[PDB]
Chains A and B, each alone.
With several copies, the nearest count.
Chain A
Amino acid sequence: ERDEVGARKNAVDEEIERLSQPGDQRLNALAERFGGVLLSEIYDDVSLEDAPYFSALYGPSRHAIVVPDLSQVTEHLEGLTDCPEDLYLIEGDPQSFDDSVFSVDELEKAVVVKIADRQWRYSRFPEVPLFGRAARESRIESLHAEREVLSERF
């Protein structure tokens, strides 16, 4: 009779699981302690379409901490062990951030960054990109609000 709603519900449950799908705290603590802001947070507003691209673009430096003044970090580095084996620090304005320069050749669902004449980086578009968290959580809200509306119509 009417399996359109039942099929649409399943579609909403599908995407919701994918977005909220799993899946760092230490970097957050380090950020405020450095008086800086996570690059991921600066990039939390990027759309669902561009999030994978930007996340791939930046490579490992996607986990970077952005501070307006690098000298804020120096004093803390000595003896610092409570952190990932690689810690990225970029000087810039967390309110008006200038992107890094990238020599990039964009493929489908991946990018090829030329780090130097003798070094390349292949970064494929990830499921669950680091960037675009804010837009991702919003989309999940819309889906929830839509799923309930479908449930009454079910």
Chain B
Amino acid sequence: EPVTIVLSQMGWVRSAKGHDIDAPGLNYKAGDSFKAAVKGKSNQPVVFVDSTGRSYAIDPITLPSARGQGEPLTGKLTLPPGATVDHMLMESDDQKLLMASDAGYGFVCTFNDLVARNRAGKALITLPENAHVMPPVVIEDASDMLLAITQAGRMLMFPVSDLPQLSKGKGNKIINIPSAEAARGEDGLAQLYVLPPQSTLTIHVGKRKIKLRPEELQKVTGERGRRGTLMRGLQRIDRVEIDSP
């Protein structure tokens, strides 16, 4: 059966039947509210990634219905002190994924690599000083390009296949960001995409729009782990529109 697992802001979860659920409009306890939702199947394990970079797996069947307030994840999971669950995933066991930190390090892995039954989960991705976990990216096509944009406004593109595949760890650097700067929030991974090579991006920066055609994206293609290319007026991105045939 198709289900929609809902996570509240205070770390409460519940399993709603179907995918027509209005999660934000659900009933949350006082002071609590919607945080995230994920759509999957009842036979599919739901994966949780906490703020420290650990992954956990829970069988949806064991979760309470969305008819109640739900239950605290602490009931089934033991997270590091002060940690919170920031990401949920439900994909096929073989589904290729892109894990990364905002320090510019990351690796390609499989959904199965995140599945940790034990309540303490597993150390999936290691975070450098003051680094944060990036939103994991689902790799639809093994031939897609990896696109990275830094806070400083630098871009780098290369086949996602170039990024070494790991089951855990800090990973290798996607784009070159000075470790010292990253640890001070002076620079870092601002955006991370995996998309077809003939894609067109429309980037919203304040009251301006920067349109990058496949031709422009070509000029920023290079080797994994490089600087790489500095863009004009591409800091403080508000929104990114991606057109991919």
Contacts and interface: CB of A to CB of B under 8 A. Distances in A.
Interface string A109-133: 0000000000000000000000000
B206 A45 contact: yes
B153 to A, nearest CB: 9
A54 B207 contact: no
Interface in A83-98: 94-98
Contacts of B207: 42, 45, 94-97
Interface in A33-67: 42-43, 45-47, 50, 53-54
B83 interface: no
B208 A42 contact: yes
B227 interface: no
Interface of A: 42-43, 45-47, 50, 53-54, 94-99
A28 B174 CA distance: 46
B58 to A, nearest CB: 42
Contacts of B232: 50, 53-54
A42 B204 CA distance: 12
Nearest to A97: B208
A31 B198 CA distance: 39
Contact of A98 (B206, B210, B233): B210
Given A47-B235, A96-B208, A99-B211, 4 more contacts: A47-B233, A50-B233, A96-B204, A98-B211
Nearest to B204: A96
Contact of A46 (B204, B209, B211, B233): B233
Contacts of A47: 233, 235
Contacts of B233: 46-47, 50, 54, 99
A43 B235 contact: no
A92 to B, nearest CB: 9
Report which residue of B205, B206, B211 has the largest number of chain A beta carbons within 10 angstroms of its beta carbon.
B206
A53 B234 CA distance: 13
A45 B233 CA distance: 9
A99 B209 contact: yes
A96 B204 CA distance: 7
Interface string B19-59: 00000000000000000000000000000000000000000
A28 to B, nearest CB: 17
